[PDB]
């Protein structure tokens, strides 16, 4: 019931401009769990189905099977944003500790934290 | 060229709820390889409504950086912007100011 890091929620990213990721789509919570408890906002990364293989180091793949997704998808850690909690709709799932390790690594690469 | 730590003016709007909106300076935090090849940047909002860090993901910035008033870098307000959203390049953060940002970012995304 409380929003946790690694949770996967469905959320409306629109409206967007240019090469920003829009649409209603799954997103993964990447904000820290203390911030998840007190802030009115969470930090997410978009999950897309237009690709199913990682193109760049900030992409992390995820099976459709284990995660109740339409298609095999990739987590876009180069498409991350802060959302108000009201944006989060159904809770789809949550990432295994192994998948979140991939995410955290892609995140370090993404934001040049080495 | 768009570089990490640069500070640009950008239109964050439209936003929803407690998301930081408005035209304001933002600081690029995406890696410089992504800054070279992608059509998007990852930025953190800078606000002037406060000048002291309220939470560990806040970083204050001092005239030095060509800002209206002393401000805070909101590392809990991150977003990916199309490069077209960026307007004037106001400045770029000092190496030490960026060391702050790195550390607030680690806290922010539970990356320890």
């Amino acid at each position: 019931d409380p929003i946790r890091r690694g949770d996967v929620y469905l959320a409306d990213l629109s409206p967007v401009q240019g090469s920003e990721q829009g649409g209603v789509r799954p997103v993964v919570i990447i904000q820290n769990d203390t911030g998840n408890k007190y802030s009115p906002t969470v930090i997410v990364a978009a999950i897309t189905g237009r690709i199913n293989k990682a193109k760049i180091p900030t992409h992390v793949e995820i099976e459709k099977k284990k995660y109740k997704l339409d298609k095999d998808s990739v987590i876009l850690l180069e498409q991350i944003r802060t959302l108000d909690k009201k944006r989060l709709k159904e809770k789809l799932t949550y990432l295994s500790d192994d998948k979140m390790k991939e995410v955290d690594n892609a995140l370090m690469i993404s934001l040049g934290l080495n | 060229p768009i570089r990490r730590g640069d500070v640009y003016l950008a239109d964050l709007s439209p936003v929803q709820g407690s998301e930081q909106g408005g035209v304001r300076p933002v600081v690029i935090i995406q890696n410089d390889t992504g800054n070279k090849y992608s059509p998007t940047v990852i930025v953190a909002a800078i606000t002037g409504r406060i000048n002291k860090a309220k939470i560990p993901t806040h970083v204050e910035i001092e005239k030095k950086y060509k800002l209206d008033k002393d401000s805070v870098i909101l590392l809990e307000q991150i977003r990916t912007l199309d490069k077209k959203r960026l307007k004037e390049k106001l400045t770029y953060l000092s190496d030490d100011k960026m060391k702050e940002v790195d550390n607030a970012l680690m806290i922010s995304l539970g990356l320890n």
Partner: nanobody
Amino acid sequence: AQVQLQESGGGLVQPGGSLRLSCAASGFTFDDYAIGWFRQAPGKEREGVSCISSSTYYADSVKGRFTISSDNAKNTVYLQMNSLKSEDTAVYYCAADVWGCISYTDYGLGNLDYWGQGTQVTV
């Protein structure tokens, strides 16, 4: 998947000479995809050479001497190779990608959607 890539136009060339590669894109939407070229020497990893879509991309060592171009009618993509060098001796593969041209850069990981079989270029 739904896409045929067949590259053509290789052969032998003297240093400083020119070649034009062709890549026939059979089927698959010419417009919503990125298309470009890779090259691989013996024992080397596939290096991205150039890309185009939505915009052009060239790797550093080929800039000014190589030009990519599109003939939408013929569903082909052209790579003009001028001022060739001994180092440019390699198999050249064309490739197409749903996502965009970043797969063709040093940052991409090389996982492209569609590929051709490769044409040899020797200088």
